[PDB]
Design a protein around this motif. Structure first.
Motif, PDB file in Angstrom:
ATOM      1  N   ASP A  74      -2.206  -4.733  16.498  1.00  0.00           N
ATOM      2  CA  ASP A  74      -1.893  -6.132  16.763  1.00  0.00           C
ATOM      3  C   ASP A  74      -2.453  -7.091  15.723  1.00  0.00           C
ATOM      4  N   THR A  75      -3.405  -6.652  14.911  1.00  0.00           N
ATOM      5  CA  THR A  75      -4.048  -7.518  13.942  1.00  0.00           C
ATOM      6  C   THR A  75      -3.933  -7.019  12.515  1.00  0.00           C
ATOM      7  N   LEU A  76      -3.253  -5.900  12.288  1.00  0.00           N
ATOM      8  CA  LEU A  76      -3.290  -5.253  10.988  1.00  0.00           C
ATOM      9  C   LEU A  76      -2.495  -6.046   9.961  1.00  0.00           C
ATOM     10  N   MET A  77      -2.945  -5.961   8.715  1.00  0.00           N
ATOM     11  CA  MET A  77      -2.303  -6.631   7.599  1.00  0.00           C
ATOM     12  C   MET A  77      -2.323  -5.654   6.433  1.00  0.00           C
ATOM     13  N   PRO A  78      -1.377  -5.746   5.497  1.00  0.00           N
ATOM     14  CA  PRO A  78      -1.352  -4.762   4.407  1.00  0.00           C
ATOM     15  C   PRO A  78      -2.427  -5.006   3.364  1.00  0.00           C
ATOM     16  N   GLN A  79      -3.684  -5.045   3.783  1.00  0.00           N
ATOM     17  CA  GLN A  79      -4.769  -5.356   2.870  1.00  0.00           C
ATOM     18  C   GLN A  79      -5.874  -4.325   2.988  1.00  0.00           C
ATOM     19  N   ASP A  80      -6.140  -3.875   4.211  1.00  0.00           N
ATOM     20  CA  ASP A  80      -7.210  -2.918   4.447  1.00  0.00           C
ATOM     21  C   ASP A  80      -6.737  -1.475   4.398  1.00  0.00           C
ATOM     22  N   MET A  81      -5.513  -1.203   4.852  1.00  0.00           N
ATOM     23  CA  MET A  81      -4.969   0.142   4.726  1.00  0.00           C
ATOM     24  C   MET A  81      -4.737   0.529   3.274  1.00  0.00           C
ATOM     25  N   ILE A  82      -4.366  -0.410   2.441  1.00  0.00           N
ATOM     26  CA  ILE A  82      -4.233  -0.155   1.017  1.00  0.00           C
ATOM     27  C   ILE A  82      -5.620  -0.231   0.398  1.00  0.00           C
ATOM     28  N   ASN A  83      -5.864   0.601  -0.608  1.00  0.00           N
ATOM     29  CA  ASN A  83      -7.162   0.661  -1.259  1.00  0.00           C
ATOM     30  C   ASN A  83      -6.923   1.093  -2.695  1.00  0.00           C
ATOM     31  N   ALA A  84      -7.233   0.215  -3.639  1.00  0.00           N
ATOM     32  CA  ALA A  84      -6.892   0.461  -5.031  1.00  0.00           C
ATOM     33  C   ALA A  84      -7.875   1.377  -5.741  1.00  0.00           C
ATOM     34  N   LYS A  85      -8.983   1.750  -5.102  1.00  0.00           N
ATOM     35  CA  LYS A  85      -9.948   2.645  -5.733  1.00  0.00           C
ATOM     36  C   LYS A  85      -9.395   4.044  -6.021  1.00  0.00           C
ATOM     37  N   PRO A  86      -8.673   4.729  -5.106  1.00  0.00           N
ATOM     38  CA  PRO A  86      -8.039   5.990  -5.530  1.00  0.00           C
ATOM     39  C   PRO A  86      -6.996   5.813  -6.613  1.00  0.00           C
ATOM     40  N   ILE A  87      -6.275   4.694  -6.619  1.00  0.00           N
ATOM     41  CA  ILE A  87      -5.243   4.480  -7.628  1.00  0.00           C
ATOM     42  C   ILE A  87      -5.867   4.235  -8.990  1.00  0.00           C
ATOM     43  N   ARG A  94      -2.808   9.867  -1.755  1.00  0.00           N
ATOM     44  CA  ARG A  94      -4.028   9.579  -1.013  1.00  0.00           C
ATOM     45  C   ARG A  94      -3.911   8.289  -0.209  1.00  0.00           C
ATOM     46  N   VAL A  95      -3.315   7.243  -0.786  1.00  0.00           N
ATOM     47  CA  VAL A  95      -3.299   5.966  -0.080  1.00  0.00           C
ATOM     48  C   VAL A  95      -2.225   5.966   1.002  1.00  0.00           C
ATOM     49  N   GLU A  96      -1.160   6.752   0.829  1.00  0.00           N
ATOM     50  CA  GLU A  96      -0.196   6.849   1.914  1.00  0.00           C
ATOM     51  C   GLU A  96      -0.747   7.722   3.027  1.00  0.00           C
TER      52      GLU A  96
END
Lengths: 50, 67
Positions: A37-50, A22-24
């Motif tokens: 241009d502004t993305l960071m690995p914080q918003d695309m990842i989401n620990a709620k499904p995990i 789901r998160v991928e």
């Protein structure tokens, strides 16, 4: 010779990986959309499904 | 430490660029005369300047002579 143990480690690993599917999917949606241009690995990842 | 994606650097960049607009009459008139006008050249005297060098009643330090 046809049936096997699937102990606690492998089951939890598979549930972890089907959580990660789901998160991928989410990160592939987000990165397939632009505005990178502004993305960071914080918003695309989401620990709620995990 | 600008946190990544915090956009404060972008906001400050836009604010500075607003200040850096070339309608700024504080220095763009100086840059216009820089693009339109020139300056004066002083001529040196090799002889009379030595008289005022001898009017200097001390010895120049090496770091001040190069200055």
């Amino acid at each position: 010779g046809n049936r096997r143990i699937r102990s606690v480690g492998e089951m939890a690993e598979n549930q972890f990986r089907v959580g990660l599917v789901r998160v991928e999917r989410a990160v592939k949606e987000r990165l397939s959309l632009g505005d990178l241009d502004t993305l960071m690995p914080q918003d695309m990842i989401n620990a709620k499904p995990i | 430490l600008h946190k990544l994606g915090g956009d404060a650097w972008s906001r400050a960049r836009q604010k500075a660029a607003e200040k850096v607009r070339d309608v700024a009459a504080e220095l763009l008139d100086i840059y216009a005369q820089r693009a339109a006008k020139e300056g004066f050249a002083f001529k040196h005297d090799r002889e009379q300047y030595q008289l005022f060098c001898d009017s200097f009643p001390f010895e120049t330090t090496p770091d001040q002579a190069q200055a």
